[PDB]
Amino acid sequence: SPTELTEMRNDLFNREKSRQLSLTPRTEKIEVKHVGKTDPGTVFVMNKNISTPYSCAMHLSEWYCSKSILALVDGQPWDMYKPLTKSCEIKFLTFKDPDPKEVNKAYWRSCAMMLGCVIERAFKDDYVVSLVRAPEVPVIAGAFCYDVTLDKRLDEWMPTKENLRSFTKDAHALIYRDLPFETLDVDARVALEIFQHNKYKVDFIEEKASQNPERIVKLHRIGDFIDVSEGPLIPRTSVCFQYEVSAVHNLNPSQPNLIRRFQGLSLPTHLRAQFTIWDKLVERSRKMVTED
Amino acid sequence: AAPKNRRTIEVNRCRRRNPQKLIKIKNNIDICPECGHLKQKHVLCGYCYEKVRQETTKIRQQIGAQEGGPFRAPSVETMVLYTGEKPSEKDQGKRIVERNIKRPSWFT
Amino acid sequence: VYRRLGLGPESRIHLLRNLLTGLVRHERIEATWARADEMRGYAEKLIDYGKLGDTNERAMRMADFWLTEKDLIPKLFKVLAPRFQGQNGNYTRMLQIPNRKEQDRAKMAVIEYKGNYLPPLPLPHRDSNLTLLNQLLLGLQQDL
Amino acid sequence: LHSKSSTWWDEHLSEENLSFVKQLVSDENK
Amino acid sequence: HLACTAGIFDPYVPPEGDARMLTQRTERLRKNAASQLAIRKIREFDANFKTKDFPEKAKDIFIEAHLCLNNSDHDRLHTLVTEHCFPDMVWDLKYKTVRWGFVESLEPAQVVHVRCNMYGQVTVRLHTRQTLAIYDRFGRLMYGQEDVPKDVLEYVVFERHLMNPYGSWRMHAKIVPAWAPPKQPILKTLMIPGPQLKPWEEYE
Amino acid sequence: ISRKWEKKNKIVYPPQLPGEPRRPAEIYHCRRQIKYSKDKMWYLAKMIRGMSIDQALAQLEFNDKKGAQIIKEVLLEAQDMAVRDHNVEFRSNLHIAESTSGRGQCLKRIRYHGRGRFGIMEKVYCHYFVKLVEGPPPPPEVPKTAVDHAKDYIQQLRSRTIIHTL
Ligand SMILES: [Zn+2]
Numbered sequence A: 001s002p003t004e005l006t007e008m009r010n011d012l013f014n015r016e017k018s019r020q021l022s023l024t025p026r027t028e029k030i031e032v033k034h035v036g037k038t039d040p041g042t043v044f045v046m047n048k049n050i051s052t053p054y055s056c057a058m059h060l061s062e063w064y065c066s067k068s069i070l071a072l073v074d075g076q077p078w079d080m081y082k083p084l085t086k087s088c089e090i091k092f093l094t095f096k097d098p099d100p101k102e103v104n105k106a107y108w109r110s111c112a113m114m115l116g117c118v119i120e121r122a123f124k125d126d127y128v129v130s131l132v133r134a135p136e137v138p139v140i141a142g143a144f145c146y147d148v149t150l151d152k153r154l155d156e157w158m159p160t161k162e163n164l165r166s167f168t169k170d171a172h173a174l175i176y177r178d179l180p181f182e183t184l185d186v187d188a189r190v191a192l193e194i195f196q197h198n199k200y201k202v203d204f205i206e207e208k209a210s211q212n213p214e215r216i217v218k219l220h221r222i223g224d225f226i227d228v229s230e231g232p233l234i235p236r237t238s239v240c241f242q243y244e245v246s247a248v249h250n251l252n253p254s255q256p257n258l259i260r261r262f263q264g265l266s267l268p269t270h271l272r273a274q275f276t277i278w279d280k281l282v283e284r285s286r287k288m289v290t291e292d
Numbered sequence B: 001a002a003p004k005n006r007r008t009i010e011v012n013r014c015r016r017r018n019p020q021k022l023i024k025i026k027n028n029i030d031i032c033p034e035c036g037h038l039k040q041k042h043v044l045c046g047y048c049y050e051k052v053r054q055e056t057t058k059i060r061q062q063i064g065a066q067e068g069g070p071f072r073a074p075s076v077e078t079m080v081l082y083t084g085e086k087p088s089e090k091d092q093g094k095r096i097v098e099r100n101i102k103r104p105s106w107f108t
Numbered sequence C: 001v002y003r004r005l006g007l008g009p010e011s012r013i014h015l016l017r018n019l020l021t022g023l024v025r026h027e028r029i030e031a032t033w034a035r036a037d038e039m040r041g042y043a044e045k046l047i048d049y050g051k052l053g054d055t056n057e058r059a060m061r062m063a064d065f066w067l068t069e070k071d072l073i074p075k076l077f078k079v080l081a082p083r084f085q086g087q088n089g090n091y092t093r094m095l096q097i098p099n100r101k102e103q104d105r106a107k108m109a110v111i112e113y114k115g116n117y118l119p120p121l122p123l124p125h126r127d128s129n130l131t132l133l134n135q136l137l138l139g140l141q142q143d144l
Numbered sequence D: 001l002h003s004k005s006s007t008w009w010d011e012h013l014s015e016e017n018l019s020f021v022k023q024l025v026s027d028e029n030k
Numbered sequence E: 001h002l003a004c005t006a007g008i009f010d011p012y013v014p015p016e017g018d019a020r021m022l023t024q025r026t027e028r029l030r031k032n033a034a035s036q037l038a039i040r041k042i043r044e045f046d047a048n049f050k051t052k053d054f055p056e057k058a059k060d061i062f063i064e065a066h067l068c069l070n071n072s073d074h075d076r077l078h079t080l081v082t083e084h085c086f087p088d089m090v091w092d093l094k095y096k097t098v099r100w101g102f103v104e105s106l107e108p109a110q111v112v113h114v115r116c117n118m119y120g121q122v123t124v125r126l127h128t129r130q131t132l133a134i135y136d137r138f139g140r141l142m143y144g145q146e147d148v149p150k151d152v153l154e155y156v157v158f159e160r161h162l163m164n165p166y167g168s169w170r171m172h173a174k175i176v177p178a179w180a181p182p183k184q185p186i187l188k189t190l191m192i193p194g195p196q197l198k199p200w201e202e203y204e
Numbered sequence F: 001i002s003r004k005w006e007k008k009n010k011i012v013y014p015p016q017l018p019g020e021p022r023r024p025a026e027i028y029h030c031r032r033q034i035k036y037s038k039d040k041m042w043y044l045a046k047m048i049r050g051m052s053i054d055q056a057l058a059q060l061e062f063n064d065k066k067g068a069q070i071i072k073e074v075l076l077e078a079q080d081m082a083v084r085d086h087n088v089e090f091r092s093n094l095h096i097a098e099s100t101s102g103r104g105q106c107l108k109r110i111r112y113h114g115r116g117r118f119g120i121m122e123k124v125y126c127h128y129f130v131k132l133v134e135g136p137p138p139p140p141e142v143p144k145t146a147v148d149h150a151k152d153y154i155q156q157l158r159s160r161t162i163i164h165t166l
Helices: A002-023 A053-060 A062-067 A101-122 A161-177 A188-194 A199-211 A275-284 B009-016 B047-067 C009-026 C033-052 C057-066 C072-083 C132-143 D015-029 E024-045 E054-071 E074-080 E085-091 F004-009 F038-048 F053-061 F066-085 F146-159
Strands: A029-034 A043-047 A070-073 A076-079 A089-093 A129-133 A144-150 A182-187 A216-222 A225-228 A240-250 A258-268 B029-031 B038-040 B078-083 B095-102 C028-032 C092-097 C108-113 E097-115 E119-135 E141-144 E150-161 E170-175 F026-034 F094-112 F118-134
Touching: A002 A182, A002 A188, A002 A225, A043 A053, A053 A062, A053 A089, A062 F053, A070 A101, A101 A129, A101 A144, A101 A161, A101 A216, A101 A225, A101 A240, A101 A258, A101 C132, A129 A199, A161 A240, A161 A258, A182 A188, A188 A199, A188 A216, A199 A216, A199 A225, A240 A275, A258 A275, A275 C132, A275 D015, B047 B095, C009 C028, C009 C033, C009 C057, C009 C072, C009 C108, C028 C033, C033 C057, C033 C072, C033 C092, C033 C108, C057 C072, C132 D015, E024 E097, E024 E119, E054 E074, E054 E085, E054 E097, E054 E119, E054 E150, E054 E170, E074 E085, E074 E170, E085 E170, E097 E150, E119 E170, F004 F026, F026 F066, F026 F094, F038 F053, F038 F066, F038 F094, F038 F118, F053 F066, F053 F094, F066 F094, F066 F118
Parallel strands: A029 A089, B078 B095
Antiparallel strands: A029 A043, A070 A076, A070 A089, A129 A144, A144 A258, A182 A216, A216 A225, A240 A258, B029 B038, C028 C108, C092 C108, E097 E119, E119 E141, E119 E150, E150 E170, F026 F118, F094 F118
């Protein structure tokens, strides 16, 4: 049963948190200086691997928390809820920054991860659904793409307008739930055990472990659902305001399994869109998206 | 003309606590990135404007001293120069105002 | 089509006359929003009179009456008029300023003469095209 | 602040994108 | 009327490694040339003051004074310590509840150095394990651990008014050796505000 | 005159036991003498009730009434002492639990009139009371759905008891 996999998957996620917490003895104070343009030069003494950038935002004002989606730690993008590691220089990133390219990637990746969660639970337990990977496509493409391999039983089934709406309802429920994006750095050995069943995920885990000298891999968890991430993700699911599953395109060479690439569009609350604009964007997001 | 009877506090409380009479909240408040202070969407920031407006008075004070007399408005264009900046050929035939301060970053 | 200001229609002209003279001397004046809008139309029309030419007798009469200080008359024909010869309009820029904290909370606005040598006002800047929403629209533009 | 804010269609539309939007609306109407 | 004088007549210099350390007692025997004449002056008014037995009397006052803090026995603590010492001990403890206990002393207390119209200050060397836990007005714990012993070595200076007939030995000040480890940090996290500038000024 | 609001800030709770949740901070601040009407000040107090510290400050900054500026100054003083003396870690983690205004001692004078009449002149003063609870403002009330309303009516019908019978 799928619940069994989530239960054991959730536990290993919890055990890793305990090991990291046990790894750090006592509370270590790290001096972090605010390099952000606003309120520059403020220095916070923080507990190592215990506090997060959100705590610093709480320290200053609520405006920081609402408008801060990411943090620049020593010039590196850090999640708002990622525990701090050392004394550093911290700056807050907003949706309206001059260069939202780093922010765009995190929003792009987070949307793909959320879509993957919908697919696995959307289908009945009778059918077998295996997620292959989340292809990285530019924002210019007009839609975020997620690839999934279905069971032979679903070879002849194509989503209808109502079925696509059902996926958005699941996505909308997740946004309504407002589940924070948990972040863990896990070794390949543990990650392989967590996702041993899905061979496609296994190779993706191997690639990330291969690139870096260690076996540490980036894992993100939304509630029970867990997935690997190419980079930082959105702090919470409530950020998205508009969500739509534009269309699904079936890859022709899909004999061993039916591989479908799902097209979707989402917009954050900070960036609302007019009714006509969204309709055209959704229409432009129903076209097959190639990777370039 | 006086009321036939005293108005009860309970009746009075309802009138003054009616939503129509209560103070309404505003949702158009915005933040100023430049000064880091609050502003309205249709209203410019004032903390930075204070620098520009008060800077203008300093420039105006220099202009007033240079003219030295009433009804002495030049019939030629005027330009402002700060320390470290030298007049160019294009500046020829234009009133020049000299400021001891260095060229402000915001001013271009 | 005309605001009621001052103690009478003639006072409005005198009040408008004083405001117009002050703007020319300084090129940037702060006043109540209602009054600033009323004087904006006159300022633009005056520049057209300046563009007409100094030798124009009507312009000289208009310039003399509206500008109390006569040193400004050479400036209009030799500074203001030459500057805007290329431009066909929109000589004056009016912007909203936070209301006065003088216990009356009057609506405040700043009216300035364009092309001036004064420090640039903190004008609003539209969103950059690098924003996620703008980038998506750019993609639609490229496809079309 | 997690509170409602006022927005309009032209709030976040750039000059280049704004011109494109006007052309698109005319095309849709036609 | 002043029964105490702020500061120490001559500051004794602790040697690094004294915690590891007869021996040091003989160093006093060697150094009584500097201190015995002072010891005689205390002895002249008292004649029972001995460096060997003073720490036992001194230790009780130090421990007793700490106990008063938990009960806020200001009157009792007033007698134990000098006027200079009292305000420092309790001023920052206002509207706070502290649980303090004394674990067995790691090493015996020993007189280290003494000096002296006439005010006599006696330096005492004390290493002891203690437990400290301070809570907020709401009772929330803000500093220290309830039942964790902390080993601290410090030098404690007691003072007495020799001239006054009722003069007695009261804790005056503590000498902190540089080699001693830093105190435990506060549980809460603090924020350092940035520089303040006028509207005209720009960040630097 | 009574100044029991300040005494509420001097209350010291017993040390919390290990098996007890971390007590949220409560701060009582007031300005006893303001040359302002309590009734007019009450309108400001009523609107700000239950709002966050930051949200209230933003509204006050754009408020036209004189009392609002005073309220913001009072709020800032309470926040400063809260961190300094009430061990508040986060400045933003504050909300307006309570806000009300009270009458203050006034001054009496005779109001002369140009036509030989006279009146009783009063210089009004008022007190302003606010209690701040550490933490975000509580979530707003959600209107009851039709399902909720129907269930209560059915439950009421079942709860009906026979009256005046054996
Ligand atoms: Zn600003």
